[PDB]
Amino acid sequence: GSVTVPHPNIEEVALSTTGEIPFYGKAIPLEVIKGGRHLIFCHSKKKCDELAAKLVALGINAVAYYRGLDVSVIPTNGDVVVVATDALMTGFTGDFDSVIDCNTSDGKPQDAVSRTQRRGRTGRGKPGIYRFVAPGER
């Protein structure tokens, strides 16, 4: 079927029930988004609002970017984690320590290029890391 391009520069990880920020059946350990800058990919705008504001309460500076959103994400305040869907349109991304994604759009499993395009975020200068909720389909 579709063959996504490889990319060993990024380490792949499997989200698990470990952390304080509850996610799609997984618990994101702040160690993946706290301690620096991270980009979280979400499939729902309502969650981007709580997920980002919630991080501010956890101790992380988080922002949500989606259709109809205001420029708020700022990579110049210590440690900021950007949680957005396909609205950031990269441009200045790439410099992230890791990318936490749900690997499923609209509740359905993403498509081959989705991770190909989404994975391209961590690994600009060093080995990026990618943590996803679901591994794939079967």
Side-chain angles (χ1 to χ4, degrees), residues 9 11 14 17 24 28-29 43 49 56 58 60 72-75 86 94 103 108 113 120 124 126:
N9 179 234
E11 203 91 20
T17 37
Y24 297 126
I28 275 187
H43 66 73
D49 277 338
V56 172
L58 268 300
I60 303 179
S72 282
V73 181
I74 44 91
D86 59 301
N103 269 46
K108 311 294 164 124
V113 307
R124 276 56 172 73
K126 79 188 284 266

Side-chain angles (χ1 to χ4, degrees), residues 4-130:
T4 60
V5 21
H7 39 241
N9 179 234
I10 279 183
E11 203 91 20
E12 285 155 51
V13 185
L15 207 70
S16 78
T17 37
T18 307
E20 240 76 281
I21 172 169
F23 210 53
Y24 297 126
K26 301 299 226 271
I28 275 187
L30 285 199
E31 66 205 57
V32 309
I33 63 165
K34 170 65 204 267
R37 293 126 135 146
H38 296 96
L39 178 75
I40 305 182
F41 267 126
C42 269
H43 66 73
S44 30
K45 214 204 90 222
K46 299 143 133 118
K47 188 78 90 219
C48 270
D49 277 338
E50 310 221 75
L51 197 292
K54 174 232 296 271
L55 247 35
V56 172
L58 268 300
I60 303 179
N61 186 58
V63 197
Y65 208 128
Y66 46 67
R67 202 162 220 121
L69 196 281
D70 309 285
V71 297
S72 282
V73 181
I74 44 91
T76 39
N77 270 255
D79 296 351
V80 55
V81 289
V82 195
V83 312
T85 183
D86 59 301
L88 220 84
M89 234 77 266
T90 171
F92 59 83
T93 191
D95 190 24
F96 280 118
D97 270 82
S98 88
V99 265
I100 290 93
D101 211 308
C102 62
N103 269 46
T104 256
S105 73
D106 224 29
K108 311 294 164 124
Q110 66 195 148
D111 53 64
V113 307
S114 228
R115 63 219 312 245
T116 308
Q117 197 160 25
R118 269 106 172 180
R119 177 238 73 218
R121 286 301 194 268
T122 187
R124 276 56 172 73
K126 79 188 284 266
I129 283 170
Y130 193 112

